[PDB]
Point group: C6
Chain length 204, copies 6
């Protein structure tokens, strides 16, 4: 899919944010949206075609593939990258609205966070952090962080137990670890950014 919608929006916020916001925008840009279109989208290509279980009964393969995979991981990461990118837009909307109000009000005759922009900023960073830890918790709860080559399936209308074999488990586990460590360092960067901003705000 095309990812040139947000760019004409995240570029405009890359004019009047702090340096930690700029480097977080840069890592979100170059390490997630770029990685998702390039290679990790190709690896999930032959998802259901190469999947195979050892039986002769018709239609058991679809049920076992369903029970193994509630969702593919790519659409999970896309929902994650949508939900971590909503709650920073309203900060841009608020500063754009108050800049418009400033340019309206001053003519009846820089950037400095004061008054309420601190509040919007900290609740935006808090929402980003809690969405991050929520998505990571859900991914650990459902899938874990390893994929075995052999799966045991125990669902109707198949007989008692069947064995199924995936396709490319190693590469997928590698990319799962990679997206995990990217999410981890993004959370750590947000935490140290909020810590530095609060320290400078109590220092001034």
């Amino acid at each position: 899919g095309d990812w040139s919608a947000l760019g004409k929006l995240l570029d405009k916020v890359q004019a009047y944010s702090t340096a930690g916001g700029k480097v977080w925008l840069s890592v979100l840009f170059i390490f997630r949206i770029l990685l998702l279109g390039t290679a990790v989208e190709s690896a999930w290509g032959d998802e259901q075609s190469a999947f195979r279980c050892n039986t002769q009964q018709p239609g058991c393969e679809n049920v076992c593939y369903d029970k193994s995979f509630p969702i593919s991981h790519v659409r999970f990461w896309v929902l994650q990258i949508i939900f971590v990118s909503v709650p920073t837009l309203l900060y841009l909307a608020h500063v754009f609205y108050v800049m418009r109000k400033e340019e309206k009000l001053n003519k009846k005759e820089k950037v400095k966070m004061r008054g309420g922009l601190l509040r919007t900023y900290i609740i935006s960073i808090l929402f980003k952090s809690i969405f991050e830890v929520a998505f990571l918790l859900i991914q650990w709860y459902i899938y874990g962080f390893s994929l075995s080559a052999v799966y045991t399936c125990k669902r109707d209308p198949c007989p008692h137990q069947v064995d199924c074999f995936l396709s490319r488990p190693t590469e997928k586990t590698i990319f799962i670890i990679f997206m995990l460590v990217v999410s981890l360092v993004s959370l750590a960067l947000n935490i140290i950014e909020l810590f530095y901003v609060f320290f400078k705000g109590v220092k001034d």
Copy 2:
């Protein structure tokens, strides 16, 4: 398909609309057209190929797949997103026409909704609301909001009853719930926007 037709049209209306109109345009932009191209278009890929019923008779699979699915859900959502996006264009057309008439008439020597723009605005929001509830009612009438893995098919030229097995029911039900809740909060946002505008119009 390409979705860069309307953008050169919905951008121009994102200059002189109210804030509720701006946030509704933003959610229609980022949560529907972006979601439709990215991931939910991929999941309906192997629609008819992976579909399978348990028989030996030729050609029964096409009839049972037809009787199960009158339309795919993606084309239904595309028709929905067309019909909720027509009746806001004529508001832009009317304000563009009267702005042209203003710029023609004033030289023979902002934005403020007065006279008839209230009427066009409220009938546009009313048409959007009734189209929304009509599409949601039709989707509840035909499909429901859950998909069973096993379907029973009872059509000629197949014998009496046959069983059919779909592909990925869980992920599709998840995305159905997701589009449902997006439509619900869009309707609620339109209702509270019209309520606020009528309250300010009787307040002034």
Copy 3:
């Protein structure tokens, strides 16, 4: 295929046409070219692969698929949208030529249809109307407006009669009805536009 050839041409005519011409250009833009790329192009994907007749003889399927379908409907609509879009270009060419001649002639020292532009306008609308009714008549003559799921085929080198089963008849009939009603309201809009223009031309 790419549809960004005409746009740099139909945009230029969307500067100096009447309001009925503008709304006809808008409906031709948003309801045909947009609909053709998005969803109805996907539904004709597995056209010949899913087609199947009940025999054991090799090669009968191609002959029966040929006799059922002289052309696919999508290429028929593309030829229709080409032939309804040629005879409006020469109006733009004529007004561009006479505007160039005006800008050449005036310097040797708006828009108002006078002299011959009425003639070009009415013959353009007449050609559009007769091409519309010709294409609709041909589509009714060959295909009708419904598709049965079962077809009886009676051609060599197959034996006497064979039965064939299509793929997704319901969705295709829905989209056929949709393109029909779009063509109908386009013809009605052109007729009422010409009626209004002739009434204003005899009123003045």
Copy 4:
């Protein structure tokens, strides 16, 4: 393939050519390059996959498909549209070179075909005409203008005679007739353009 190479070149010649050159550029633009990307490129999709002959011998199908088709028609039309578009570029190159020489020479202190531009113009139109009739003659010599559904193949390593069945003969014959009549009216337009230009050149 992408067809946005020549456009940044045929647009520049659509500033200082005659009206017959402009309408020939317009028909070459809208009726060939647009038609080739949109629909007629889709119809040649399942070219070799759906092709089938009635035997049990391995590998005969490739030899019979080769002997039936020296080239597909689409690549033949692409070579035709390249060879009819080369010998008009050097006219633009010559007028650009002499316009550069004019702008160099005049400062040491419109368009009017005089001197040698007549010669370049008539040899360009002559080369376009002879390439057109050469390509049409070759297409009539090899293929004819009709496709039978059944073909008889008589090549080693197949036994004596075999029968082969194509895919969609009717639609392909329709598009062959269409490209033929487009080429015919292009040749007639070039001839009447050269006739009018020579008549005006002997009239002056």
Copy 5:
């Protein structure tokens, strides 16, 4: 693949090169990069799928297809078009560097090849010529300029000799001849260009 990297680079050299350089850039533009994306990329589509040898042993087909084809021809032409396009970039780099040095040095208070630009020019043309004849020599050494329909394969783990049948030999031989004659006239154009430039350089 996308070929809009070099264009923003070969366009800039199409401002200050000689006329033979301009026509060589034009033929390299319109007859190679355009031809490679359009049609000849489609013909190598079903490369390995339609390939077939007559045996019952598993896996022999991959070994015989490997021994027949060290590389496909398209990737060979892509490497050729990279290696004939590197050694002209440094000429642009040198003239850009010395133009920058001129614009730096003159303000401390056209194009004319003098001093060392002759040397860079002749070694660039020499490198282009020797790379051209090297690639053509290698292509004649490995493949020849004709493809038989039947191939005899003599490799382990297949038994003694097997026969293999290609797909579309005639069309591929046609395009091989076409790329050959394009390379030949490019080499001849470079030779006559260098001859004319040296003749004018000894004439002055």
Copy 6:
């Protein structure tokens, strides 16, 4: 995938870097990102489909294909081209920040590496070199630089030993050698660039 993210970033650094940095940016541009989209992405197309081992047991092919290939080479090169392109961005970020600070500070009333830019420059080149040699060492440790046509597989649930046959080993080994020699000359260029810069820095 799209590779037009970094371009709007590596272009901006191609304004104020040294000549060795410019030619390294040029070779990274034209010989890696261009080569990866064009041809070497096509050759890894039928990766798992054409792979085949000689057995009758179900599902052994996926396990043997997994044990042969931990990752495909293309995604390995993509991770390499990401990790060699991160540690040059912060140099641009630092010079942009200090140029902004210069333009802020000077108004309270070229490029010359002094103070700390030397330090950032040498640690950037050092990080690029060590990442290059690390990736090359890992590729030599896992794969080697040759691919045999026949592989012996010794994993459960297959019986004792099985033989597997790849697809196109020769072309893949050629491209492996090609990417190897490109990486080698990139490392050598970085080394001689740092040597020249340190020699000029101790010369001044």
